[PDB]
Amino acid sequence: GIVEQCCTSICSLYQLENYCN
Amino acid sequence: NQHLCGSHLVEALYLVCGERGFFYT
Amino acid sequence: XSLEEEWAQIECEVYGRCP
Amino acid sequence: XSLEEEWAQIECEVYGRCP
Amino acid sequence: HLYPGEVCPGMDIRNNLTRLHELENCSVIEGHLQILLMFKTRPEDFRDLSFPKLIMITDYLLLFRVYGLESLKDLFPNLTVIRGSRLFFNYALVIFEMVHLKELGLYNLMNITRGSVRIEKNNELCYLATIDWSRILDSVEDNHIVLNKDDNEECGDICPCPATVINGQFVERCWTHSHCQKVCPTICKSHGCTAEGLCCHSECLGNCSQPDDPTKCVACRNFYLDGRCVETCPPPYYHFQDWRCVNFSFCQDLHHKCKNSRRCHQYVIHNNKCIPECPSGYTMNSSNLLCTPCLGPCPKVCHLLEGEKTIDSVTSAQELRGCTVINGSLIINIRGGNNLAAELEANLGLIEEISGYLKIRRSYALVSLSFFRKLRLIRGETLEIGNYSFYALDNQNLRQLWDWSKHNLTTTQGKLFFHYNPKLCLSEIHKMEEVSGTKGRQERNDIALKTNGDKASCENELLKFSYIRTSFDKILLRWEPYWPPDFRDLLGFMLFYKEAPYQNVTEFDGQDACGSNSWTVVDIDPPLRSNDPKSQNHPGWLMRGLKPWTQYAIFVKTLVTFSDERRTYGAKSDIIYVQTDATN
Amino acid sequence: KVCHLLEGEKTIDSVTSAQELRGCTVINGSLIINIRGGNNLAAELEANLGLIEEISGYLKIRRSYALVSLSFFRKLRLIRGETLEIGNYSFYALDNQNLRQLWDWSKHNLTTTQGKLFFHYNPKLCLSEIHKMEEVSGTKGRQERNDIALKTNGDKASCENELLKFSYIRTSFDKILLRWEPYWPPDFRDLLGFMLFYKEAPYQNVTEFDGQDACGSNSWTVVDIDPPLRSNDPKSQNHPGWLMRGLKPWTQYAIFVKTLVTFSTYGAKSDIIYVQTDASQILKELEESSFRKTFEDYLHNVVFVPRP
Ligand SMILES: *[C@@H]1O[C@H](CO)[C@@H](O[C@@H]2O[C@H](CO)[C@@H](O)[C@H](O)[C@H]2NC(C)=O)[C@H](O)[C@H]1NC(C)=O
Ligand SMILES: *[C@@H]1O[C@H](CO)[C@@H](O)[C@H](O)[C@H]1NC(C)=O
Ligand SMILES: *[C@@H]1O[C@H](CO)[C@@H](O)[C@H](O)[C@H]1NC(C)=O
Ligand SMILES: *[C@@H]1O[C@H](CO)[C@@H](O)[C@H](O)[C@H]1NC(C)=O
Ligand SMILES: *[C@@H]1O[C@H](CO)[C@@H](O)[C@H](O)[C@H]1NC(C)=O
Ligand SMILES: *[C@@H]1O[C@H](CO)[C@@H](O)[C@H](O)[C@H]1NC(C)=O
Ligand SMILES: *[C@@H]1O[C@H](CO)[C@@H](O)[C@H](O)[C@H]1NC(C)=O
C-alpha cells in the first residue's frame, strides 16, 4: 500500500505517479 | 527523495497529480 | 521585539499559535 | 518478650543469623 | 414520507465535485459515502450544492481533505442515520483534515447504529463541544474527536436550545448557530419525537414527520419494506443488507448477474436473509438459490492475499466474518485504547482453523485472545519467520489467551513465540505449550522468561501468615513455609507493606511502581533448608519503621527462578490489614 | 575510614541500610545493591556511598528499581575482584529496571580489576554505557568473557540518539528563549514532542542523570513541548523553540532538550548547555499518538489506489 511504498520506504516519482489517473 | 508520510504524503501526491486527480477502482 | 513578543511571533511561526 | 527478641530468635531459628 | 427517493451503491467522490451529482436523487446509500481529496473546490462550489434527499447511509461516511466545504448543513441537511453496517476502520462518521470546515451541520443526524465518530485535524471546526454525542451514538468513549479548532482555540458557539448535563454546566447543545441539537425525552431514546415532542412509532429510528405512524417516519430502526418500517421481513421477503426486504426475484436476479459476469457475490439465501456467500457448512442447491447444509464438511474457507491478513480494526476483522477456515496466516494488530473485543468476537469468533501462523503484535487494548470462540488449529503450513506458528509480541494489556480450562487450541507444526506481553502470565503461556502440543514434540519455543507477565500478579499458590505479632512501631510477621518443586528456584520472598487506613486496598497489580503511596517492597532472602521435609522453618520478617495508631496492608510474594521446567510460578498471600499498637 | 564488612557481603536495600557505610573510604568484601524505593531522598544514597573508592569483592546490583544512575558512588574507582560472584563476575547488574546511567565515564575511571562483567536485563541501560564500562574497566582489553546480552539490554530505551545543537540562546533576567536545530525522525509523526530539561546549576559539572531516581526525586524541571508544525520544504523547517519562564536573575541554568518519540529508537538529545540568564500514563499518550498515526496510515493505504 501507499504507506509501505512511500512512507515506510522511499517512493520514486514514478511510484507516486502510479497512484493517479 | 524523502519519506512521504502523514499529510505530506497527501500534499506530495497532490502536487504530482494536481488536475489529473487521484485514482480509484 | 521583546523576548516575550518575539517568542509569541516564533510560536506562530513554528507551532502556529498566534496572539 | 519483645518483638525484637522473638525476631532475633526467629533469625537464628530460620535464617541462622545470631548476635 | 419514508425514503421517498432512490437507493444507491457505495459512493466514492474524489478530485472533482462533479461526481456528487450521483447523490442528486439518492435517499439511502447502500455503501460507504467517501467524499475526499477535493483540493480544487472553493466555498463557491458548495454554495448551491445540497442533497436533502439523503437520509441514511448503510455503511460509513468519510470526509477527508475537502476544501471550501464550510459546514455539512449545506450538503446533508436531512441526513439522520449512518447505519455503519460496514465501517471504515472502527468508525462510521469520519471527518479528517477538513481544512475549511467551520461547523458541523448534520443537525438532523440522530443515530449512528454501529461504529464510532472520528473528527480529527479539522483546524477551523468549532461547534463540536456543543454536540451531545451520547444522543447520537451509544459508544461515546470510542468516539475520537481531537485536533480541531474547538480543541486549539476559543469558539464563539452562541446558539440563541436543549441543554444537557453531559457537560459540567448547562451548555446548550447546538450543531450550528442556526440549529439546536434534537434532544428527545429519555423514554424515547432511539426513535425520537415530532416537533411538538409526541414520540414516534417504535420503528422510527431518529425522527418522524407524524407521530406513532410507521410510514410517516424518517428512518427504520430495523427494516424498510414497501414504504413502511417493519420489525422483520415477512415471507417471501428475504432480508437484504440488514436494512431492507427484497423478494426472491430480486435476489435471483442479483445472483445471476454475478454469475454471468463479475466485478462479485452471488446473493444466496440463508436464514431468511440474502447474503454474499453461502455460509460455512452450507452449499447452494438445485439452482434454487437456497443454502442447504452439506453432508460432509464444507467450511467457508477464506483465502488470504499472499498468505497474510492483518486485523488492525473492526473493518479488517469484519472482512473475516464467518470465515470458519483461514487459508492463510493471521496478524492481529489492534491499536488504540479502545477495546474491540466484542467486534472481534462477532467476526473472528467463528474461525475454527488457521492454516498459517497466528500473530498478535502491538495489540494494546486486547486483554484476552478469547474473542476467537472456536479456534482449534494453527496448521502452521506457512510460519512466521523463525518457524513460529503462534507469535505474540509487545501486547501491552494481554492478560490471558484462550481460557485453557475450556478451549483447546492445537498447532500442527511450528514453534511458540512470546515476548513483551507484560500482563500475560507465563502460567497462561505454559498451559498453551501443553494444549498446543508443541511441548509434546519438544518445539524449542521462543518464549521469554522475563518479558511475559512481569507486570502482572503471577503467583498461583498461596502463602498464609502463620503468626502476626505487633508493637507500637514494629510488626513481626511469619507465614507458612514455601519452596518450589526445587527449593533452589526460590530466590527469596518479598514483603509488601503500605498504610491502609481503610481496608479497601486492592491487590498488587504487578507493576512495582515506586510512587509516594505505593507498596514498600522488602526483599527477603529465603530461610535455611532444615530438619524434616515438613520444612519446619516458617519464614518471617520484622519491620521497625511503623508508627502507632496506624493500620497497614501487608502481603508476601515469593521470588522464584523461572525455567524451561515451567513448574515454578510462585506463591502470594492475600492482603492482611494489621494494626500497630498505640502509645503516647 | 576503612570498612571491613563483618558479613563480607553487604546488601544495601534502603537509605537506612546504606548509613552503615557512611564515611567508608574503601569497602572490603563484596557489595550487593537492591535499592528499591525511597522518599524525599535528599541524595542520601550519594552521601553514604559517595566516599567509597575501592571495593574488594564484586559489585552486584539487582532488582534495583529506584536507582536511575550509579553516580551516587561519586568516588568509586576500583573493584578488586578479591571475591568474585559465581561466574567470576566483578560487576553484576541484573534487572535494574530504571538504571539509565551506569556511570559518567567522562569523569569516571572505575577499573573492575579482576573477573568478568555481567549485564542482563537493565532495559533502560544502554549498550553504549555497558561497552564504555568494559573498556574503561579493562575487562574487554583483558579478554574477559563479559556476559552482556544485546537482547534485553537497551530495549525500551532511547539509546544512541542523534545530537541536537542549540542554535539560539536569548536570555532575560527571568526568561530564556531557546531554539535548537530542527529534528525529525524518518517519519515526522514519530516526533510526539520534545522535552526540555533545565536545572539551576552553578557548576559546569552537571550530568543528565545526576540527582535523579525513579522513585520520583528529580532535580530537572522537565518541560514537555509539542511538535512543531512541519514544513514540506526541508529548508523551511523552522528551528523549534521554547521560552522557559520564571527564572532568577544572574543564575546559571544547566539545560538540555530531548526528543519524545514513539517506537517503530529514532530520537535526539542535546548536550547540557549553560546559560547565565541576565544580570503508566505515558504509555497511554504514546499509544494515542501511535493510534492516530495508525488510522492516518490506514486511511492512506485505503484511499490511495495504485492504478493496475
Ligand atoms: C441508535 O439506534 C439503534 C437502533 O437501530 C439503537 O441500537 C440498539 O441499542 C441498544 C443499546 O441502546 C443495543 O444494545 C442494541 O444492540 C442496538 N441494536 C442495534 C440493531 O443496533 C441505538 O441504541 C441507538 N443509539 C442511540 C444513541 O440512540
Ligand atoms: C436522477 O434523476 C434525474 C432526473 O429524475 C435523472 O436524469 C438522473 O439520471 C438520475 N440519476 C442520477 C445519478 O442523477
Ligand atoms: C419484487 O419482485 C418483482 C417481480 O416479482 C420485481 O419486479 C421487483 O423489482 C421486486 N422488488 C424490487 C424492490 O425490485
Ligand atoms: C477439548 O478437548 C477435550 C479432550 O480432547 C474434549 O473432550 C472437549 O470436547 C474439547 N473442548 C472444546 C471446547 O473443544
Ligand atoms: C578483607 O578482610 C580479610 C579478613 O579480615 C582480610 O584478610 C583481607 O585482607 C581484607 N581485604 C583487604 C583488601 O585487605
Ligand atoms: C574463575 O577464575 C579462575 C582463574 O581465572 C579459574 O581457575 C576458575 O575456573 C574460574 N571459575 C569460573 C566459574 O569462571
Ligand atoms: C560539581 O562540583 C561541586 C563542588 O565544586 C559539587 O557540589 C556538585 O555536586 C558537583 N556537581 C554534581 C552534578 O555533582
Author numbering:
A (entry chain A): 1 to 21
B (entry chain B): 3 to 27
C (entry chain G), D (entry chain H): 0 to 18
E (entry chain E): 1 to 160, 169 to 271, 274 to 594
F (entry chain F): 310 to 573, 578 to 592, 690 to 718
List sentences quoted exactly from the publication behind this structure.
The human insulin receptor (hIR) is an [αβ]2 homodimeric receptor tyrosine kinase that upon insulin binding signals into metabolic pathways that effect glucose homeostasis. Insulin binding brings about extensive conformational change in the receptor extracellular region that in turn effects trans-activation of the intracellular tyrosine kinase domains and downstream signalling. Whereas biological activity of both Site 1 and Site 2 peptides in isolation is minimal, [Site 2]-[Site 1] fusion peptides are IR agonists, with the most potent reported being S519. Here, we present single-particle cryoEM structures that show how a 33-mer polypeptide unrelated to insulin can cross-link two sites on the receptor surface and direct the receptor into a signalling-active conformation.
To obtain a high-resolution view of how the fusion peptides interact with domain FnIII-1′, we determined a 2.9 Å resolution cryoEM structure of the Site 2 component (“IM172N22”) of IM172 in complex with the hIR ectodomain. We thus bound IM172N22 to the ectodomain construct IRΔβ-zip pre-complexed with insulin and with the variable domain Fv 83-7 of monoclonal antibody 83-721. Our single-particle cryoEM map of the IM172N22 + insulin + [Fv 83-7] + IRΔβ-zip co-complex (obtained at a GS-FSC resolution of 2.9 Å) allowed ready recognition and docking of the insulin + [Fv 83-7] + IRΔβ-zip “head” module derived from PDB 6HN53. Inspection then indicated additional density features on the surfaces of domains FnIII-1 and FnIII-1′, situated in equivalent positions to that observed for the putative [Site 2]-binding region of IM459 in the structure presented above. The salient features of the IM172N22 FnIII-1 interaction are as follows: (i) IM172N22 residues Glu3 to Val13 adopt a mostly α-helical conformation. (v) IM172N22 Trp6 docks into a hydrophobic pocket formed by IR Leu486, Gly550, Trp551, and Leu552 and is stabilized within the peptide by packing against the side chains of IM172N22 Glu10 and Tyr14. (viii) The side chains of IM172N22 Val13 and Tyr14 dock into a pocket formed by the side chains of IR Ile534, Asp535, Pro536, Pro537, Leu538, Asn547, Pro549, Gly550, and Trp489. (x) The side chains of IM172N22 Ser1, Glu4, Ala7, Gln8, Glu10, Cys11, Arg16, Cys17, Pro18, and Pro19 are devoid of interaction with IR. The above interactions align completely with the “D8” motif10 and are effectively conserved across the two copies of IM172N22, despite the non-equivalence of domains FnIII-1 and FnIII-1′ within the single-insulin complexed structure. IM172N22 engages the same FnIII-1 surface as that observed for the Site 2 insulin in the four-insulin-bound receptor structure. However, there is no relationship between their manner of binding: the IM172N22 helix is oriented approximately orthogonal to those of insulin.
